[model samples]
Target chain A: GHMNTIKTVIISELEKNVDEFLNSYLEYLKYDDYDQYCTMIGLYDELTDQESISQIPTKYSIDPINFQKFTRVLTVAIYNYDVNYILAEKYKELFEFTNMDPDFSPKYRFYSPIATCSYLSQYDLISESFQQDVTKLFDRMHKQQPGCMLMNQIMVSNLIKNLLKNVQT
Target chain B: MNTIKTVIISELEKNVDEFLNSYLEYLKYDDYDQYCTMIGLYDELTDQESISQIPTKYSIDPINFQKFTRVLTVAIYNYDVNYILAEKYKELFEFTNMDPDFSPKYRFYSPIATCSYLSQYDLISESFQQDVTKLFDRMHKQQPGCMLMNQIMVSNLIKNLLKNVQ
Candidate 1:
């Protein structure tokens, strides 16, 4: 339903050193101290080291393109929240690595991590039955008339490789 | 690590008698209540709740009665995993098994076995895994396999039967 923005939020949360970005944001939201959310995606990312993914592999993989999406999100969160500068730059580096066009990008510069997390998180809010009420840009893109922009397919392999970088025992 | 039990075992000892008993007892345990305790606060076990049964009013299906039971067990399974390793088990969790009823089964799964298979599994910080392992081991001793499953079924069934939390 609200799927688009939630995923962006989730990925964005993962960036900015996660702790600094969230601690800062949650303080802004006025929720709990550190315990903001508990998600399957987050857990899967953390413990894939201990678990098996082959049986039911991931349908979505965030490669450089998506990783760039992640990087941009951190950039936005840092810029907007005025949270951690170092983390923000770090995220900027990550976004830069993704090789996205700096001069011209999406409407709001994506805040990549933030936007992506928001997209994914929306999935929980907008129930499937209620999904009809939620606007899916991608779905619309597919059924678009001739000149409309379409969403790109995400590269799966590159994403898994980079994400697996921090899986230390 | 309920020895990969929990949800899978709810029906392990199930039979017609137990099923009937479970139905009757579920009512007594307050599973149907949707008070603030359920939605907003007081993290009650979801298996005991009757959220799935709400669909019955829309349509009638002979097989649909078992839907809530399946959901409860599976959610708790994933919950157990979360309680155990939290983040360290994500990849293991993202991966899947052959079961069609994955929705409920993912909750309380094993991360150790899963990680080993992916070749990405690294033994996580020992303290977290060890503590949860110890607790699970103790639970294993306090209640043997059959008895533990019995408790879960009884607990959730009673809650369901009651349609309200106690």
Candidate 2:
């Protein structure tokens, strides 16, 4: 009975740790330069080198497996952010162009993040577990007052989850 | 000067015909109907009176020809010709009782071999073949995901090209 209780406690502690790590990362996303924030936190080097979890530096006081999980989620998050950022900038430019000349018909289409996630998953770029984690994160973040970046992340995560379900069938 | 101009024009025409012939061969081997649909020639191909009329139509219709060339060029750009060459070389080696060694030097030399093979087959013009070789060399040096990203980019380019065909 005591052993069973201890196992439950351990799992709870691990979940708490993961939650704290994700929370910190969420805060980091709010920074003006997320890359610079990653650099400051010493994650930039590891990420850029595409180092395996075991090979990651021992500076962070978290389990390597947990760190790997975090990295997986972080990669998808960054990809979503960058894709939306570029799209937003392009839309802004097109809007300004249209304002200057009303007859300028700007042709643009929002890329399907679901199809992209499916493609990436097909190519073994991401794992099923990480996709699930992103989906959970999206649900949690959606309840809160999320910023534009976080909103985009939630939308992309939702799309990825839907596409994954369809693929499963 | 007249003789030189004639020589130049004849060489240009020969290169163009060579490129078109290889492209047509590729279309024949691959998805001809899909390519025809993409270039807005599906209906014409379907309704053609005879097989002889298809080539005539392709030659006479400059608009569809331009579309076909653009689609073919983009397809060639995205084609993993190096992989094909590597596979061919691997098979040849297997037949000759030679083991394949994927060394850095081997990787560097394969594209050159691929270009030579293409030239030997008269598969593409010298300039376009050189471009494909350079692309393969660059792609070889890139990270793993880079090639997939290039595929997605090329897919987008083809989509945009088809969109403008109307």
Candidate 3:
């Protein structure tokens, strides 16, 4: 009885417009009082779903710290979804932070999980090269298990891979 | 006040096993849960006190509220954490569930509080010393930057002591 049917609906209302989500969230950003907002949070209590009462006090405003937390989460999410260009601009606009410090690591570090997942997905879909790479990876791991220690075997495989890559070129 | 409470608690646990193994005392108290607990806390029982105030609420945004229902549940019959409920908006009898691995935000893990409240209610003699010590040790060691997180402070001290002896 439970698994009977799947329903589909039109996606007109709750589509993914980043600007809309951020603006609608900040619509009541006029309040700065922590106690006032804490009370409001108590009134709203449920962290997952209380959209029925979106009516924050019109005069009440959002605090900068909270707005920063919310937007940091939002921007990290954006970075995950390949929307970093939009987020980078917004980061500059809103926080006046991260003004192109030359010492900073490339932005891809934070997005590594998503990148790894995406790369694995592509590796799954590719042809014989995928099979060869996977097999080679496992074989290299297994060679140094019995006699030699892992560190030594890994060094051997790393050299082998370098040689193999050169031969392929 | 807490120092290596986790390690102490864990040591007490290991020591109890050691006490049993060293003296072959297992058969005498194998069925006694209190005995087992007391054995673990015997080293730290003199240091425990009542839990004072604890913050019970967190700020939540309205957008993510629906998915956050029933995030925390406590077993204390005396304390009413229901003050945290969302405006009496429960669906009379409908049942719902959340994620498995990610610690469903609704379930409040309150084992220590339960043990404390229950020990007092059940009025089970002075033997609660062991469990209380273990709990204190645990509260210091593993609690996430809690009021009782000073356990780690004690942990570092113990580490220093070990290093000095070594």
Off by over 4 Å in 1: A1-73, A78-92, A96-120, A123-169, B1-166
DockQ scores for all predicted structures:
0.02, 0.03, 0.01
Provide all candidates' interface root-mean-square deviations: 18.6, 11.9, 19.2
- Model 1 per-residue lDDT at B77: 40
Q: Model 3, A5-104: lDDT tens per residue?
A: 1110111111133333333333222224234434343332122222322233323454433433343323333333222132343234322321221122
Candidate 2 docks with a DockQ of 0.03
lDDT digits (tens) for residues A1-169 of candidate 2: 4433433343344333333343454331322223333433444223332233335435544444334434553344333333213222322432232222212211111223343333333222234454444444434434443366555645754554443343312
**Decreasing lDDT order of the candidates:** 2, 1, 3
Per-residue lDDT tens digits of candidate 1, residues B1-166? 2433443233332321222233332332333332112222212222223333333433423233333323222333433322322122232232221122222311222323222221221222224233333434433322222333344455455435434323
TM-score of 1: 0.21
Per residue, candidate 1 scores C-alpha lDDT tens digits across A19-115 of 4433332221211211222122242233222123221123333332223223333333333332213233334433344332233222222123333
TM-score of each: 0.21, 0.21, 0.21
RMSD of every candidate to native, in Å, equals: 20.9, 20.7, 23.7
Write down the worst ten-residue block by lDDT for model 2 chain A. A100-109
Best by DockQ: 2
lDDT score for residue B144 of model 1: 21
Among all candidates shown, the one with the greatest lDDT:
2
For residue A36, what is the lDDT in candidate 2?
A: 36
